[PDB]
PDB file of C-alpha atoms and ligand atoms in Angstrom:
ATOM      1  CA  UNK W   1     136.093  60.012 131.716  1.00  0.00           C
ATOM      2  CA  UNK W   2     133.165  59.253 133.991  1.00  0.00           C
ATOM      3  CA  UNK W   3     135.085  59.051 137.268  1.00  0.00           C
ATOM      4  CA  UNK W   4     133.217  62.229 137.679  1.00  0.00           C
ATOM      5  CA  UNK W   5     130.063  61.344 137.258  1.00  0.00           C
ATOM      6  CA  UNK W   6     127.074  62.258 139.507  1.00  0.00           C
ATOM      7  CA  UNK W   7     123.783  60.510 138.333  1.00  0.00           C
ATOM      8  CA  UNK W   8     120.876  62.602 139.923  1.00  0.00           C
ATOM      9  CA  UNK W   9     117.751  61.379 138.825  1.00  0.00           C
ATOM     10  CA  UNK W  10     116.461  57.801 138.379  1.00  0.00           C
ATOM     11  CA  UNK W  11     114.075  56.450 136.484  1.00  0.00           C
ATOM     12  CA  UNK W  12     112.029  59.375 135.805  1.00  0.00           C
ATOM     13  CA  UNK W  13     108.189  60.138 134.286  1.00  0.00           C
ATOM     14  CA  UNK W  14     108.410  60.869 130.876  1.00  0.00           C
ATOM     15  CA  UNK W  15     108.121  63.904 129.731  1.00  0.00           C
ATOM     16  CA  UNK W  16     110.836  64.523 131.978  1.00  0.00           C
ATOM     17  CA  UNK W  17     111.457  68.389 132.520  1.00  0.00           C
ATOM     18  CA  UNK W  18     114.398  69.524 135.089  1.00  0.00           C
ATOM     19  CA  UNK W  19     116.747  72.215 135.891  1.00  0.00           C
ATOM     20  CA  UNK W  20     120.206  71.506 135.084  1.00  0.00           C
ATOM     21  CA  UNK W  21     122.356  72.494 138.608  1.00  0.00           C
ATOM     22  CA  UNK W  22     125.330  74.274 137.174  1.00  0.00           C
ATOM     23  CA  UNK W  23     126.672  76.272 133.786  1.00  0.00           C
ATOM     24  CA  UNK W  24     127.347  73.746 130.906  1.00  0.00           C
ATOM     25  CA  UNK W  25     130.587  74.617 130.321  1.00  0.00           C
ATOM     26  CA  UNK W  26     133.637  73.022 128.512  1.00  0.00           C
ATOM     27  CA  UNK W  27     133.815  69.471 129.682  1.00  0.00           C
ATOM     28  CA  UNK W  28     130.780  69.170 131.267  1.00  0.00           C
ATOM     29  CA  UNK W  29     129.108  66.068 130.836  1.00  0.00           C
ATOM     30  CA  UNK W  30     125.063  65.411 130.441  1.00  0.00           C
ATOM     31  CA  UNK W  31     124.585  61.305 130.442  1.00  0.00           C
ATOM     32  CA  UNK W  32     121.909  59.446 129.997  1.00  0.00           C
ATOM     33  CA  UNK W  33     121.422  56.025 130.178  1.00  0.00           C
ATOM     34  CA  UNK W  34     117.791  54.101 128.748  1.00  0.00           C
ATOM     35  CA  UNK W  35     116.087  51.962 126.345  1.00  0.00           C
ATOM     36  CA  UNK W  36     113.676  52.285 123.185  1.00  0.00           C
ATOM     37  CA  UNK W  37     110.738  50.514 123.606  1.00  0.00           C
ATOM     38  CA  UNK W  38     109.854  48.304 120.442  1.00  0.00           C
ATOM     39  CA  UNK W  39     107.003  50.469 119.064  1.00  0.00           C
ATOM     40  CA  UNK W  40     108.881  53.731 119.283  1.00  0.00           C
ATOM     41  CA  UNK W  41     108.841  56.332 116.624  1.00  0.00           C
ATOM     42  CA  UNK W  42     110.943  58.552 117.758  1.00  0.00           C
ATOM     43  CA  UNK W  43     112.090  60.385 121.148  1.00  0.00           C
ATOM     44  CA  UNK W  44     114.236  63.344 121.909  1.00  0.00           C
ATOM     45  CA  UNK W  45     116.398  64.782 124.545  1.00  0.00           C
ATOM     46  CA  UNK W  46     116.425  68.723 124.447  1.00  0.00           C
ATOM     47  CA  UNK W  47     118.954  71.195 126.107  1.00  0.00           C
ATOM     48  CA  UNK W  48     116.247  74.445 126.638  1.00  0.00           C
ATOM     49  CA  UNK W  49     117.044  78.199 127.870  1.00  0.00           C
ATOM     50  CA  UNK W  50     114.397  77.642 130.299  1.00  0.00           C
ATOM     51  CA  UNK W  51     111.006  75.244 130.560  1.00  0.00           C
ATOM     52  CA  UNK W  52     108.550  77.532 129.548  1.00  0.00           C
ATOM     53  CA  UNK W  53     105.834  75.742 127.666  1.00  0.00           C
ATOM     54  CA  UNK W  54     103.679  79.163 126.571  1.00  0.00           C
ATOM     55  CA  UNK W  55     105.015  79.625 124.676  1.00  0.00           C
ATOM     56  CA  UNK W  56     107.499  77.104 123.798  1.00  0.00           C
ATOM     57  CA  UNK W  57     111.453  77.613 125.268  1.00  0.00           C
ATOM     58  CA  UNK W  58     113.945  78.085 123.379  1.00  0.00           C
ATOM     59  CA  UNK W  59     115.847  74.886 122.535  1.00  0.00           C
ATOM     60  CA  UNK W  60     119.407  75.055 122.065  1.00  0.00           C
ATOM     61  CA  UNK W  61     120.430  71.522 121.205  1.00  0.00           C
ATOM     62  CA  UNK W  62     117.463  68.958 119.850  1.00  0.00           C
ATOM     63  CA  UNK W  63     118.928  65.510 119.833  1.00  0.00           C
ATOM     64  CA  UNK W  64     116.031  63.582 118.060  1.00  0.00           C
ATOM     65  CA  UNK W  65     116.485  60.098 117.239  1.00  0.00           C
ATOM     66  CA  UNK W  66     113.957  58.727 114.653  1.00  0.00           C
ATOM     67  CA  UNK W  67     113.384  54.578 114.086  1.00  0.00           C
ATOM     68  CA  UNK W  68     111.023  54.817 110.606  1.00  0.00           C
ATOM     69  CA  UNK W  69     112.906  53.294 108.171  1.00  0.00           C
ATOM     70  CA  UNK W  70     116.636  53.196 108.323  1.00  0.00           C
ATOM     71  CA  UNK W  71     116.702  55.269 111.219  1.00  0.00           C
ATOM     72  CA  UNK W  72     118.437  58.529 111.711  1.00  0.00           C
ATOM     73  CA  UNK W  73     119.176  61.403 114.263  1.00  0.00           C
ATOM     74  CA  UNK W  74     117.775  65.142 113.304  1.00  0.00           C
ATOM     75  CA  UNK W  75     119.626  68.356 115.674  1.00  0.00           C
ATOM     76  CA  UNK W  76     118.387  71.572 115.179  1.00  0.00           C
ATOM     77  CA  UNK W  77     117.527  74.772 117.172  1.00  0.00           C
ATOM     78  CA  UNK W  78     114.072  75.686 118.374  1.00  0.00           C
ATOM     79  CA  UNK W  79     114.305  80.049 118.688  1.00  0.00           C
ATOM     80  CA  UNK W  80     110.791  82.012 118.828  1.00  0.00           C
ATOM     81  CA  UNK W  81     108.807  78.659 118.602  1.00  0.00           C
ATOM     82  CA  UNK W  82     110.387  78.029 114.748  1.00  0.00           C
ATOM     83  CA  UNK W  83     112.831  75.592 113.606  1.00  0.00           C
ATOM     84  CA  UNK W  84     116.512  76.164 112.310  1.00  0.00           C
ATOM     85  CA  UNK W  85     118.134  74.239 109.701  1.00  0.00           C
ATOM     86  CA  UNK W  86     118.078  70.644 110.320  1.00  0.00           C
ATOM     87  CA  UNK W  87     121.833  68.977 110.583  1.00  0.00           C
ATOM     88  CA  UNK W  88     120.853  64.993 109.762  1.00  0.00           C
ATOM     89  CA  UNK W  89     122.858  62.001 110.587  1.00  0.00           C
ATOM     90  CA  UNK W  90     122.277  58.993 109.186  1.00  0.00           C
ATOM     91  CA  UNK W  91     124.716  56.507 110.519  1.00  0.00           C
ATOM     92  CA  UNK W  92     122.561  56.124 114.408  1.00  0.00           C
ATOM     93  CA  UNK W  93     123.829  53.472 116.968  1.00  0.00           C
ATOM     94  CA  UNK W  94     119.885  53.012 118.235  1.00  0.00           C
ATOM     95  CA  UNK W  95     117.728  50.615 117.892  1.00  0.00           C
ATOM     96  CA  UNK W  96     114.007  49.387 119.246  1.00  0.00           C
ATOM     97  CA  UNK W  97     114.157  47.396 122.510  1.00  0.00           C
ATOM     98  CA  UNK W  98     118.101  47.954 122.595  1.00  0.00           C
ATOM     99  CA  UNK W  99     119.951  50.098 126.023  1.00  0.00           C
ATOM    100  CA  UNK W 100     121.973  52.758 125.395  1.00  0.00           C
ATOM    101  CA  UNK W 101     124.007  55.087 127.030  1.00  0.00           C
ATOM    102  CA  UNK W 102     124.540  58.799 125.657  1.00  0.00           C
ATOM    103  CA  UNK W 103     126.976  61.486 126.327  1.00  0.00           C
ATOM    104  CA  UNK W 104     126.677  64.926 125.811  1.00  0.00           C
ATOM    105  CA  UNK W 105     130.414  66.598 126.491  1.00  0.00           C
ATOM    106  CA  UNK W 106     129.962  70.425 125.966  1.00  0.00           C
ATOM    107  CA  UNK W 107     133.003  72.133 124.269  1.00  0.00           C
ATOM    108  CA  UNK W 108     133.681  75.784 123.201  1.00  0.00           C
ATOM    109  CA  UNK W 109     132.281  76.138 119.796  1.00  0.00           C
ATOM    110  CA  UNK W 110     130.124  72.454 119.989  1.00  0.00           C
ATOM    111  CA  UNK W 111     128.353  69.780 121.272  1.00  0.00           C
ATOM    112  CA  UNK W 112     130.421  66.286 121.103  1.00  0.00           C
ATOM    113  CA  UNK W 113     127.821  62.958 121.229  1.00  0.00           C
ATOM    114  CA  UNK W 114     129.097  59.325 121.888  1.00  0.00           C
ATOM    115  CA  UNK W 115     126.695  56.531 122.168  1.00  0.00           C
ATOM    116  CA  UNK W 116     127.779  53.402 123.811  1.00  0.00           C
ATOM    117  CA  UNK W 117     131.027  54.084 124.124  1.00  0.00           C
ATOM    118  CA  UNK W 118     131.472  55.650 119.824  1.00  0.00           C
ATOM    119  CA  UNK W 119     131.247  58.638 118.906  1.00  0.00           C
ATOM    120  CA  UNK W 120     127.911  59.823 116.952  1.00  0.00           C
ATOM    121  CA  UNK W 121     128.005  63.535 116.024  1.00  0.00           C
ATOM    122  CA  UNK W 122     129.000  66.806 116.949  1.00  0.00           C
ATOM    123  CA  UNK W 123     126.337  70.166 117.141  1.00  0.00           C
ATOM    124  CA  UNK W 124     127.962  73.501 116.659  1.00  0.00           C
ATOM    125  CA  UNK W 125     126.650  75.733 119.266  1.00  0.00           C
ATOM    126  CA  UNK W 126     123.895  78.420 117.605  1.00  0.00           C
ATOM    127  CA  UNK W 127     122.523  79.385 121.337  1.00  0.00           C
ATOM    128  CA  UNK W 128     125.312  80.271 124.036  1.00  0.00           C
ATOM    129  CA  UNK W 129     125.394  77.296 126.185  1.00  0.00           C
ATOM    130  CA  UNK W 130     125.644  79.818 129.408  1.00  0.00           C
ATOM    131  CA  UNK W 131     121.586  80.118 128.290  1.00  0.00           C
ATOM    132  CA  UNK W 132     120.770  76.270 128.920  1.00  0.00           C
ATOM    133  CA  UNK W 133     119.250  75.564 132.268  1.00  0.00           C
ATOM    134  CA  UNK W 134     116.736  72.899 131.382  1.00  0.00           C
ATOM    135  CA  UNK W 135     117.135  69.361 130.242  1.00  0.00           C
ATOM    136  CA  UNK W 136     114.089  67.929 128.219  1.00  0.00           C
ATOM    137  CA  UNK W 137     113.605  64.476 127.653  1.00  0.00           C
ATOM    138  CA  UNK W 138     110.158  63.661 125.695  1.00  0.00           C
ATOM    139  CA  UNK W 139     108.912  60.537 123.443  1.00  0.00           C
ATOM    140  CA  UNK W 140     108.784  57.034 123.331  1.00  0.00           C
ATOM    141  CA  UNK W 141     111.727  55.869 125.701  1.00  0.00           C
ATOM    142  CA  UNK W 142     112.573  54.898 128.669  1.00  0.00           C
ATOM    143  CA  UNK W 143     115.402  56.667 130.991  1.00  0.00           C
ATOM    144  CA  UNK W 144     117.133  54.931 133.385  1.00  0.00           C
ATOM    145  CA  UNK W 145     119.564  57.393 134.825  1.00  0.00           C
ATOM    146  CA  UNK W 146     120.122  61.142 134.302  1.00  0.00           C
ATOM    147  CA  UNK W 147     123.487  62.641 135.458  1.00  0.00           C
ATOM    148  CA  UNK W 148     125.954  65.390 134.911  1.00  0.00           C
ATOM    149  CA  UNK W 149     129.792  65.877 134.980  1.00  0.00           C
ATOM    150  CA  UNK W 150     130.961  69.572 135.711  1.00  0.00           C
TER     151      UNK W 150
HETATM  152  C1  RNQ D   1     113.076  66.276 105.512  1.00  0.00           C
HETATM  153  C2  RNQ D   1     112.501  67.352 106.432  1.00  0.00           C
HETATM  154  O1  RNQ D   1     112.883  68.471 106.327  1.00  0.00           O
HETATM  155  N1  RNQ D   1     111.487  66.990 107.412  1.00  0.00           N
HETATM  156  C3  RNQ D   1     110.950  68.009 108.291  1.00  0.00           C
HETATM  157  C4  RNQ D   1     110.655  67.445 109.693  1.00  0.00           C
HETATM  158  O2  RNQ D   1     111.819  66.854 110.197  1.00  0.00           O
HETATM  159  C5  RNQ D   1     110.110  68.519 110.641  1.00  0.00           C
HETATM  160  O3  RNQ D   1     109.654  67.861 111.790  1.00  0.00           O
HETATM  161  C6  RNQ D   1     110.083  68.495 112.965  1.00  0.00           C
HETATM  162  O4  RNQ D   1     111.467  68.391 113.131  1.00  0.00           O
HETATM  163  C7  RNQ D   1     111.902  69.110 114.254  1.00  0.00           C
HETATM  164  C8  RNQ D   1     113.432  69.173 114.223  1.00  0.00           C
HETATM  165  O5  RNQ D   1     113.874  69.720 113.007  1.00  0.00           O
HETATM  166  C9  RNQ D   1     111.392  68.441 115.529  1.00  0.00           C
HETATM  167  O6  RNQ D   1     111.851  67.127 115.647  1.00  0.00           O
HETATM  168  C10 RNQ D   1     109.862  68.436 115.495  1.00  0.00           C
HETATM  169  O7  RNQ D   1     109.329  67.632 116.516  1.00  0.00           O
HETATM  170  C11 RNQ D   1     109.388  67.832 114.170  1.00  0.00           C
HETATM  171  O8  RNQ D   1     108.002  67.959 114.000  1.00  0.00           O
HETATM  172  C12 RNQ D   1     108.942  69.218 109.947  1.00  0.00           C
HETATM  173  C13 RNQ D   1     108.523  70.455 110.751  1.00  0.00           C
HETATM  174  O9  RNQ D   1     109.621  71.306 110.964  1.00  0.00           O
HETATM  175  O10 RNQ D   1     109.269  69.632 108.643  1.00  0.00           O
HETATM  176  C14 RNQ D   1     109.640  68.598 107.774  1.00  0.00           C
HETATM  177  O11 RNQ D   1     109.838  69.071 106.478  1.00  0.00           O
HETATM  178 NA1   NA D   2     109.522  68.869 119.192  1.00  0.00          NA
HETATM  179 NI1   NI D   3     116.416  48.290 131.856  1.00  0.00          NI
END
């Protein structure tokens, strides 16, 4: 499953903004590896068409994970600098001061998300994924590892 795994950055500043090196197509694997600090609110990783900033890139997949209360995990679409419909989900494996490791496996018609090892939630696809170049990670957390699967 990871046997083809190539982690290419380590350990990087956040805001981390970098160009992904191939087309996300079906099977390809983003993973990222971290931690939550304790006093985090909330972070996000974010699959962009592109890293302008303004203004703001498109954002094809927003993987937010939010710690207030019960926690949760918002996706949505950033087009034109305005947010889409939000698609919540409730049941989140993360937790303050706990690692984790996520996968991103892009499909045909979806993103597919395990964390740890369990699956979390899938994304249908509302920007062609042939438009993502960029991989956005902003917040409070901290990355370990970044690497793709093609
Ligand atoms: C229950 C609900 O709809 N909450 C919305 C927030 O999630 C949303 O925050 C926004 O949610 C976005 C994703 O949908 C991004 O995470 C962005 O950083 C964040 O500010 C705001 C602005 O769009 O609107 C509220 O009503
Ligand atoms: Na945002
Ligand atoms: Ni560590």
């Amino acid at each position: 499953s990871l046997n083809n795994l190539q982690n290419i950055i380590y350990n990087p500043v956040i805001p981390f903004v970098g160009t992904i090196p191939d087309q996300l197509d079906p099977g390809t694997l983003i993973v990222i590896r971290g931690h939550v600090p304790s006093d985090a609110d909330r972070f996000q990783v974010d699959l962009q068409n592109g890293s302008s900033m303004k203004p703001r890139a498109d954002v094809a997949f927003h993987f937010n994970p939010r710690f207030k209360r019960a926690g949760c995990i918002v996706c949505n679409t950033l087009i034109n600098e305005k947010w889409g419909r939000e698609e919540i989900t409730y049941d989140t494996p993360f937790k303050r001061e706990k690692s984790f490791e996520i996968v991103i496996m892009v499909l045909k018609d979806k993103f597919q998300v395990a964390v740890n090892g369990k699956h979390t939630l899938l994304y249908g696809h509302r920007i062609g994924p042939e438009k993502i170049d960029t991989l956005g990670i902003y917040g409070k957390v901290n990355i370990h590892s970044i690497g793709f699967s093609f």
